[PDB]
């Protein structure tokens, strides 16, 4: 059931979590990507990525405040995906699609990998 | 903007955060309401409530792992609102609307107070 639903609720929650990230409020992890640092909320990362879900459900790794990703990872690709996690918007361009796809495969972001493969197949 | 958007992203993030709450994964606060305890994620509470936003942006209160609410607050009303925070769905019924509205006013959940006032005005 006898529920009502607020259509904009989930997107408003995301917008507010992105504002907390922008102001560095309650961020609890630093992700390091080829010497560049990105602050974030562990719960948002886990909710969006198979890799972060595996890391932060691990009894040892859940205690870490700094996570280093493989240095071959493209930090612009990571930044594009982190923005997607917090906004639902993916800035996919001809010049970044290969890097974004590789990063999404590494992060285990299935829907993102799916859309990249579709855009690449349409280009060929 | 040159973005694409994943329609279900924000609701999938909420569904996953609700699954973390159900499994007690990375919950970082206990809310106590008339001797009943509710575990949650501070960031989700802040994103949904003016009261929790004020508490967890305070330099002293942000360190607390237990928050006691006014004991006059109805814990069923709180539980209904916590479920709304994590699902966008509000279980509003004739038998709980007055308690839900009072709790939403206390929590500073403006859109919820708005819909309660509308349903009450339609009933009179």
């Amino acid at each position: 059931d006898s529920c009502i639903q607020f259509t904009r609720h989930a997107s408003d929650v995301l917008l507010n979590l992105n504002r907390l990230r922008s102001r560095d409020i309650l961020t609890d992890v630093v992700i390091v990507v080829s010497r560049e640092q990105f602050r974030a909320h562990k719960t948002v990362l886990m909710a969006c990525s198979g890799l972060f879900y595996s890391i932060f459900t691990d009894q040892l790794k859940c205690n870490l405040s700094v996570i280093n990703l493989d240095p071959e990872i493209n930090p612009e690709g990571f930044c594009i995906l982190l923005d997607f996690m917090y906004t639902s918007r993916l800035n996919l361009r001809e010049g970044n699609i290969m890097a974004v796809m590789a990063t999404a495969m590494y992060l285990q972001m299935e829907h993102v990998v799916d859309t990249c493969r579709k855009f690449i197949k349409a280009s060929e | 903007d040159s973005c694409i958007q994943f329609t279900r992203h924000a609701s999938d993030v909420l569904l996953n955060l609700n699954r973390l709450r159900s499994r007690d994964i990375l919950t970082d606060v206990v809310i106590v309401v008339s001797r009943e305890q509710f575990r949650a994620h501070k960031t989700v509470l802040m994103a949904c409530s003016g009261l929790f936003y004020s508490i967890f942006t305070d330099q002293l209160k942000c360190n607390l792992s237990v928050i006691n609410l006014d004991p006059e607050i109805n814990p069923e009303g709180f539980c209904i609102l916590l479920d709304f925070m994590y699902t966008s769905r509000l279980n509003l019924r004739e038998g709980n609307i007055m308690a839900v509205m009072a709790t939403a006013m206390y929590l500073q959940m403006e859109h919820v107070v708005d819909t309660c006032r509308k349903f009450i005005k339609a009933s009179e």
Partner: peptide, 5 residues
Amino acid sequence: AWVIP
């Protein structure tokens, strides 16, 4: 907004 889910 409010709708029927």
